[PDB]
Amino acid sequence: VLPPRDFKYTPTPGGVVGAIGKNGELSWLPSLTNNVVYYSIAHSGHVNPYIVQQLENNPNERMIQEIIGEPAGLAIFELRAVDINGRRSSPVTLSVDLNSAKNLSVVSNFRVVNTASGDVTEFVGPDVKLAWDKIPEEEIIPEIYYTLEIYDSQDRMLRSVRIEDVYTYDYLLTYNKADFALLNSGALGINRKLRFRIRAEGENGEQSVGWATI
Amino acid sequence: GNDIPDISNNVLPPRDFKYTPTPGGVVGAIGKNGELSWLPSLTNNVVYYSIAHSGHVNPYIVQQLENNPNERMIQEIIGEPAGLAIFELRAVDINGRRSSPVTLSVDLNSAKNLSVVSNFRVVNTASGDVTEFVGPDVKLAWDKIPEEEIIPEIYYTLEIYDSQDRMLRSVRIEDVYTYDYLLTYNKADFALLNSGALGINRKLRFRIRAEGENGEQSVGWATI
Amino acid sequence: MISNNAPAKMVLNSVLTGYTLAYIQHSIYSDYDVIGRSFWLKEGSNVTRRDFTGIDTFSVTINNLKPTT
Amino acid sequence: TVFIYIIGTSLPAKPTSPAYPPSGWSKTPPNRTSNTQNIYCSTGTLDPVTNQLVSGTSWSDVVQWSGTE
């Protein structure tokens, strides 16, 4: 089977099919070899390849298949055809990056409750209290959660914590010493300059855009 | 009537994802692309490491059976077509959790196969704080790039930035492994040029990258 | 990541007055790159700058001041 | 002396023993779990010779430690 042509992927900025996040769409031109019955596409990280049968009208108009709900990130799509005798075209690859299924609104506000009145960006207490507003359009998506990452002065991540149903994280001094100073250097220590970034992620491939910090 | 809140910790992605390229002259039919390295994830209970590949649907997997923190690990790729490449590496937990992606895109070409500048460090950094330099000026040093002997000439291009990403002090440097950003070079030259006044600039970012005398440049710029 | 930090602004805890000598209690520096401390007096008509080498002590003694000023 | 001395879920009752380290009561702010909080007491004057509260002057009212005292 001659490989299918025009195997290209066009993102869909705003996508919804039955009120769930829709990513872009991937399209291709039917193989020129006759008797092709269906075009099978292999998707990385998926057990079941996506199969769409051709049609008697395909010889003229290229077919398209839509991909919905996958998370933002890289996808490897492999396209190959079949023959009624089982003969198969050589696979066609398309390595691309995918946008989030539903671009979510950034966190409204993100601040530290325990902040010095004398100057901004100074926590006085031993434990850093981190709070932020509930994401808007929450009722649109059933289940959501936030991913928070902590970075050092010299840019080494310290912990990636996933929080669900709560918008007020409670960083502890005991964490900062025991779980972080030792893990990052192997010796007792304290990190004074901290850094925080948070994203709002839904489940069905829904991811916020632009991070959020203070 | 509502989800019960919970606190969960993810898998710390492996650090120092660096693609180490091999410029060895290999036959045209099959070209051994250089290997890539990434230090083991800090969090324990990591079983293997799944890296996505541009040309392969299936991801290459390297399994960490031992426990050797600070000790690098290597995965090599051979025969891949020359061109643009994008890599995404994620760590995986013994229970089944997967870490956040670690991305690194490098364009594949025989002449483009030049390593990043190594040992990019600020010598005059203050003792207590690595991100602080005591000296009135900035004195900067770096290691000689490997495989510089075969190539007749390599000049590193050093990019300097400010609190905002502003291009300044792009220096054409050949056969020098240490650069000093003098105070006169700092405030007299570009502080006035950009800010429009004598006021100095304190926050700085540095970025160096090897360049070919005739060929193209290195795989990527070197981190501060 | 690399950056520079200006010395933290100090706070003059107290000043004891002498009709020729001035004693000032000030906070301590907290930055490694600190090399010296300086002062800027104001006669009310002309501004005079004074600096003292060394940062060992928390106190200073400004001399050569105009009495009853 | 003023010491911050509880990893406490609820407001405790002020100490009754006049000893600078009170009855099983810490002398420095310990580490806490997210649920718990910190409570201090403005301890009365301490007697270094006896290393305990001088006669009288019992412990101050315990107040949850928010930020800095």
Side-chain angles (χ1 to χ4, degrees):
Chain A
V1 179
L2 309 201
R5 280 85 67 203
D6 206 4
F7 184 41
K8 66 178 184 290
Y9 165 69
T10 70
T12 54
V16 170
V17 174
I20 77 170
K22 170 173 69 174
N23 276 323
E25 56 83 15
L26 73 165
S27 44
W28 62 102
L29 185 83
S31 292
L32 204 63
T33 296
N34 201 10
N35 316 322
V36 61
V37 60
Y38 60 70
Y39 293 90
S40 88
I41 281 149
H43 182 200
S44 55
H46 289 210
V47 304
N48 185 2
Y50 300 145
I51 171 168
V52 168
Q53 58 160 0
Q54 79 162 355
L55 200 59
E56 288 268 322
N57 319 325
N58 279 117
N60 293 318
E61 177 52 86
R62 63 200 299 263
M63 74 302 284
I64 308 85
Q65 196 267 329
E66 309 177 355
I67 179 61
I68 78 185
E70 297 302 309
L74 281 180
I76 322 301
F77 275 132
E78 215 54 36
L79 161 58
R80 82 190 79 193
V82 297
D83 282 338
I84 56 170
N85 300 356
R87 205 58 38 92
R88 270 215 315 281
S89 69
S90 79
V92 184
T93 180
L94 183 63
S95 50
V96 297
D97 200 324
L98 273 79
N99 54 3
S100 171
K102 223 158 187 175
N103 270 356
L104 305 180
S105 314
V106 304
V107 189
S108 302
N109 74 338
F110 187 77
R111 76 290 192 191
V112 168
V113 183
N114 201 4
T115 179
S117 68
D119 187 75
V120 55
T121 60
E122 288 88 14
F123 69 99
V124 294
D127 312 334
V128 174
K129 326 279 167 162
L130 205 56
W132 61 101
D133 198 7
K134 166 196 196 70
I135 184 179
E137 58 93 25
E138 170 268 341
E139 287 75 16
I140 306 304
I141 322 300
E143 178 267 340
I144 53 173
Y145 63 84
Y146 304 101
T147 293
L148 170 68
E149 61 189 6
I150 307 170
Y151 285 110
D152 193 65
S153 180
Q154 47 86 26
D155 184 76
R156 302 209 275 109
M157 208 197 73
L158 295 99
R159 156 181 297 150
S160 171
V161 62
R162 182 191 162 284
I163 189 71
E164 183 171 358
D165 200 77
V166 159
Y167 317 92
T168 316
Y169 182 76
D170 189 7
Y171 197 53
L172 289 177
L173 188 153
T174 184
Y175 293 162
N176 173 36
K177 50 189 292 182
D179 299 8
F180 293 359
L182 283 166
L183 273 291
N184 301 328
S185 43
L188 175 70
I190 287 297
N191 299 351
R192 275 177 146 81
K193 193 174 170 91
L194 283 65
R195 175 162 325 285
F196 301 79
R197 293 201 300 194
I198 181 171
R199 298 217 319 284
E201 284 92 335
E203 201 54 39
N204 189 0
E206 292 88 8
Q207 173 181 349
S208 187
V209 172
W211 289 96
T213 177
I214 179 53
Chain B
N2 51 20
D3 170 40
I4 191 71
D6 61 354
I7 322 299
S8 197
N9 276 343
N10 293 318
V11 171
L12 314 182
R15 76 203 163 292
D16 196 24
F17 189 100
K18 184 136 164 172
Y19 168 58
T20 55
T22 52
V26 182
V27 296
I30 295 293
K32 174 194 149 44
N33 319 111
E35 62 273 8
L36 57 86
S37 66
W38 70 106
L39 275 156
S41 179
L42 278 299
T43 183
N44 56 78
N45 299 9
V46 60
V47 293
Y48 62 89
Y49 291 120
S50 185
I51 187 169
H53 188 252
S54 56
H56 294 89
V57 182
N58 45 2
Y60 304 68
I61 291 169
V62 162
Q63 199 280 321
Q64 183 178 2
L65 76 166
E66 85 297 18
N67 300 99
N68 291 355
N70 183 275
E71 201 280 339
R72 307 222 52 168
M73 64 184 73
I74 295 95
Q75 214 286 344
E76 65 95 20
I77 47 159
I78 171 162
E80 309 296 339
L84 183 53
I86 311 98
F87 304 110
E88 173 193 59
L89 186 41
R90 322 191 67 186
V92 293
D93 208 326
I94 185 173
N95 300 356
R97 308 273 155 288
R98 194 179 298 191
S99 87
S100 65
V102 187
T103 56
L104 188 135
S105 172
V106 298
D107 216 349
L108 270 294
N109 174 16
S110 58
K112 181 68 173 66
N113 182 313
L114 294 174
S115 296
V116 182
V117 184
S118 64
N119 213 41
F120 202 47
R121 319 165 297 100
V122 192
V123 180
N124 67 318
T125 182
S127 62
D129 179 29
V130 304
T131 68
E132 203 71 87
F133 58 96
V134 291
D137 70 300
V138 185
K139 65 184 321 303
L140 182 60
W142 55 96
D143 178 23
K144 157 178 182 179
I145 186 172
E147 55 80 31
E148 194 175 353
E149 307 81 6
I150 47 170
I151 186 77
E153 277 271 275
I154 290 292
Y155 51 95
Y156 316 134
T157 292
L158 174 67
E159 292 98 4
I160 313 300
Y161 301 134
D162 311 338
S163 176
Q164 62 274 356
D165 202 27
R166 265 281 292 99
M167 201 55 267
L168 73 165
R169 193 65 65 194
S170 48
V171 289
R172 166 53 166 69
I173 287 178
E174 180 65 32
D175 296 345
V176 180
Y177 309 145
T178 294
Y179 168 73
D180 305 341
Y181 187 69
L182 276 294
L183 161 72
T184 67
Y185 274 89
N186 188 359
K187 62 169 177 90
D189 283 333
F190 293 100
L192 183 63
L193 186 141
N194 193 12
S195 298
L198 192 173
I200 201 171
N201 65 332
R202 291 183 166 262
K203 261 271 188 197
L204 287 178
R205 303 278 147 265
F206 299 70
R207 223 183 65 196
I208 193 170
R209 50 184 71 194
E211 311 283 322
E213 190 54 58
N214 50 4
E216 54 268 30
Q217 48 173 309
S218 60
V219 289
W221 61 270
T223 303
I224 301 164
Chain C
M1 290 98 70
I2 185 65
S3 60
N4 173 23
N5 199 247
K9 48 156 54 166
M10 51 155 178
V11 179
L12 305 178
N13 310 125
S14 84
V15 60
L16 190 143
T17 286
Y19 48 74
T20 302
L21 214 58
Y23 189 108
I24 289 166
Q25 293 179 356
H26 67 77
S27 62
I28 314 304
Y29 67 97
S30 61
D31 270 334
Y32 292 164
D33 51 0
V34 174
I35 59 161
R37 48 158 188 254
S38 69
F39 299 79
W40 288 284
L41 282 169
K42 193 59 195 165
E43 190 185 353
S45 176
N46 189 19
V47 64
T48 303
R49 180 178 77 90
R50 274 196 169 81
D51 59 314
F52 314 130
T53 185
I55 44 178
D56 46 0
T57 177
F58 48 72
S59 60
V60 289
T61 51
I62 298 163
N63 63 338
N64 306 342
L65 297 195
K66 313 180 66 171
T68 79
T69 306
Chain D
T1 183
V2 170
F3 55 76
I4 310 194
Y5 63 99
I6 184 57
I7 309 302
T9 61
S10 168
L11 201 55
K14 73 192 78 66
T16 178
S17 301
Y20 174 39
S23 57
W25 267 109
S26 82
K27 298 163 72 173
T28 46
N31 306 324
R32 40 168 294 275
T33 310
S34 176
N35 68 96
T36 57
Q37 67 262 5
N38 264 347
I39 300 98
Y40 64 90
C41 64
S42 278
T43 297
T45 61
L46 181 69
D47 201 5
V49 297
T50 78
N51 284 322
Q52 46 180 355
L53 278 185
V54 298
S55 181
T57 179
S58 300
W59 316 87
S60 173
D61 301 317
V62 307
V63 182
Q64 177 180 353
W65 178 36
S66 80
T68 61
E69 66 191 4

